């Protein structure tokens, strides 16, 4: 399980 914080990410 991975949270992505950024522009262009899921």
């Amino acid at each position, epitope marked *: *399980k*991975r*949270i*992505h*914080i950024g522009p*262009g990410r899921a």
Partner: antibody
Amino acid sequence: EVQLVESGGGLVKPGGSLRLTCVASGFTFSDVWLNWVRQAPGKGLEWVGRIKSRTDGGTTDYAASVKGRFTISRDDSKNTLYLQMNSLKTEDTAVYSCTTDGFIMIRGVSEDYYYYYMDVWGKGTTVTVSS
Amino acid sequence: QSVLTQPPSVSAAPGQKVTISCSGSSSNIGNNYVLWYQQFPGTAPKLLIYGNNKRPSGIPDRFSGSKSGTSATLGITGLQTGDEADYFCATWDSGLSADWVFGGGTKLTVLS
């Protein structure tokens, strides 16, 4: 020992073309997302666009101010990022540099958080659009 | 001529506190996370804060960050002459091209 070295900058007449190249070293190039940013004299940093990794589709995004005229591409084969500029306008005059999207990873209780940011930055190459 | 707005400069004496604001819109700061960078003349920007208020290893807690609505702030306590540099905020636009957006930078002078 990471770095990004761009080149190809110079003087171009309004309407002309220019091709900037950026070479990377010190990390696995194919795995990172790349950005082109620019800073005109006096103004603030402006994001030009990016090209995602091949693993993420290799698609490109462009700032509204350059879509249709600029094109980004990568050659993972030789750690090189490209910026083809067409129909240049004097307002495109600026220092162009490449950057990579890096990340700080934090392990939460149940999830793993990846916070992205422009990590490695090139020194830039100057592009002057003037008659 | 700057997507996010920050005061152009700020000054204080060593040992003092200081804060730098960064104003945006719902489309950027309001919707996402703010990052803060530090830059010294002739060098690449160094990540200072991410996820609005987190510090990367190596960054002392004299540095703090906060975000309220469409505005973000960076604080620095116990100023040292060595903190004299440029500071800019960044985020991304929640639009289709997902632009990285930047502040014009604020020059912080540590009275020497």
